[model samples]
Target: GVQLQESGPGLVKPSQSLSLTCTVTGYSITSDYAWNWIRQFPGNKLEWMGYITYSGSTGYNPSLKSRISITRDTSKNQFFLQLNSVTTEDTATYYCASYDDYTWFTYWGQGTLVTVSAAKTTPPSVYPLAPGSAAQTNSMVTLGCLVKGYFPEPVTVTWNSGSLSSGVHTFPAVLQSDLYTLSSSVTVPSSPRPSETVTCNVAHPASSTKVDKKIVPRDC
Candidate 1:
């Protein structure tokens, strides 16, 4: 089976350009296959960045058409991606996959998480730490928020509960692996009633946007 790997900056400042390289093995990059880049972000969306053919032909997401560039180096059996003017929304775990036909992804890389945020200053894009789980005990749960690739610190995370109680606990701002954006978590009892909703809100000084996220409610 063919294998691909992505190598790029772990952190990129806002408004600056970012570049990534997809190095492949077990197959020639100059063959009939097209090397592609796909990213899974915070939300329930997978953004198809684009592809670069063996001969260097390219296709990109229309929205990023003006700012995205795909290139290749046949000798290195590698392809490259250059994205400009990116922000927090672009933060994602990017994978390099091989496309053999019009609709086939024959193989994919392990993927690399790239944060489009500055270490000095940026904003938070609420996401998750573990994607929440069905509690195995007490019916209590802790939902962790990953403010993926954001900064300007001192960010705060809070549940929709009116006030803190013995049943409530909020974690502190945690420095993530990227050494940029921080993550926090909050724990609360499951709604004893039906259709209970778990909501979290976050605030930061970088942008006026206050992010709110809801964990998908599971059956009790």
Candidate 2:
């Protein structure tokens, strides 16, 4: 079995760019594997970062079409991500992943979180967090979102109420070498309040638009 891991700072303050590195294990960089990056926003959704291949090919999300880049060093069997122009909206968890020829993430890393606060200097994009389920009575509860992919980016998991429940959501990242697809996931809580809703959002370096999904809690 092959394995991938992400390493970087746990926190990135507001206005400061976030950088992370992804190391691949159980396989060589010369092998057939596309590296990617993904992220999740707090109480939002999942978004794709970008990807790079063993041959040095690259592809990035249209949303992040301009501000995302993927690079690798075969000597260390490692790759990385560099996101520019970040804010609190960019705060989230990021992941490093690997994909098969058909474009599916078969392996993933533990992920890291980066926060954008007032005291921080220039930071990169803030990753999105996934929304978890809550058992509120009648009040509206907001869930977090998530994103996925390769290195140099943080993998974050957050909620409006600061908790998790159950269930999961999936989203795709940019394709690499036209043969590999990358993706990320956000877990939603099982029980939700009547007035509350769960949303997923994605932020990248290029464009400022956020891709999002909202789920309203209901009774059967």
Candidate 3:
């Protein structure tokens, strides 16, 4: 049940120190665990910055020994990373990971994007908003739609005709890399044509056309 998330500014200026926070839940930092800060460059090159053990002792990659600092706050169960004198070469997606006593990485954060002078941004990765998991009862059928990896909150997601007012639920959005994502499910009549007829319409600033998808059920 352990979890970790990395949060920080999306952009960092050259020659300035880059600071990031790793918020962890379901686990405490004062226990016997090692927290680490690692990053991947443009070409998939990874660099392990360093780690701060539960005892507050630190270990660093010699290449980054002079520029990186990893520390923690036991009161908040959070750890931090600071890289000094950053340059354009330092731009990468940074992740905070947990290492167990056996020296294996047990958990990791979703990773946060950091850019020097701001590099070109990429579009969000495309994924199915909802899987083909359908639930049906004698009275109504339920459909699930998951919308994730998109930025700019308040994306519109609706059932057919946009007129159903009952049995519709939308979960709160989660933020990662400054993007908001969530799921919405709607209820419909349990009819014979429930195989592939429900429509999920999505509207967002990232796309010019309103995206639509056919919702159907799939067996697990």
Candidate 4:
């Protein structure tokens, strides 16, 4: 099995950019897989930085479009993330992951928390929420759910409308810590109705199963 690991400073000073590295073992760097970086802000939500292939192709998150970059060194079998102009608003834990053909994160690192505190304060409550939005006709819309303070394993997100099986959606892991969280999202075609509901289930390492939350369009 391919295992991923993250290593970097656990704390960063304010106004300084945070950097981290994702090292992959048991896999060739020249393979056709893309490495990704994700993070969660304090008292906020999850964010996607971008993804980079060994060949240097990249697909960045539209929200962080101008603030992220992924680079690699084939000889080192590793990739790195450079986030610029970071501030207190960017304080959070960072995770590295790899995805399969269907855009599902199959493997992820344990994650490293980077706090932008001149002095640390009490951490905020990390709760899971289901966030949804509408899409145009025949187009796909992505919904997101987040869980904080769960770790050592990846949580699964599934869509449920009463009892119908809308299919299971899984997102990348968010590091393992009592203070960490997991966020998952999926894209589906928009319906003609006023809105839709998507549920996020968070499975913690110490628990037997998952905890659930539901999100609707108006909540987005």
On residues 51-148, what C-alpha lDDT tens digit does candidate 4 reach at each position?
99868888898878788878887899999998877777777889898877686548878877776645432222224333343355456566666655
Root-mean-square deviation of candidate 1 = 12.0
Q: What is the TM-score of each candidate against the true structure?
A: 0.55, 0.52, 0.55, 0.51
* Model 4 / residue 209 / CA error / Å: 34
Model 2, stretches more than 4 Å misplaced?
A: 101-105, 119-220
Task: Return the clash pairs for model 1, or none.
Answer: none
Model 4: worst 10 consecutive residues (lDDT sum): 120-129
Specify the highest-lDDT model's number. Answer: 3
Q: Rate the local accuracy (lDDT) of all candidates.
A: 0.72, 0.60, 0.74, 0.65
In model 3, which runs have C-alpha deviations exceeding 4 angstroms? 101-105, 118-220
Per-residue lDDT of candidate 3, residues 1-220 (tens digit) = 8899998876677898999999999988877778889998867998888998888999999999888888889899888999999998887999999877676549988987786753333233323333344443456666667777765344677766585546778787776665667788876666623654777676754344366767654556
**Residue pairs with clashing backbones, model 4:** 147-181, 147-182, 148-180, 148-181, 149-180, 149-181
* Candidate 1 residue spans exceeding 4 A from truth: 101-105, 120-220
Candidates in order: C-alpha RMSD to true structure: 12.0, 14.1, 10.3, 13.5
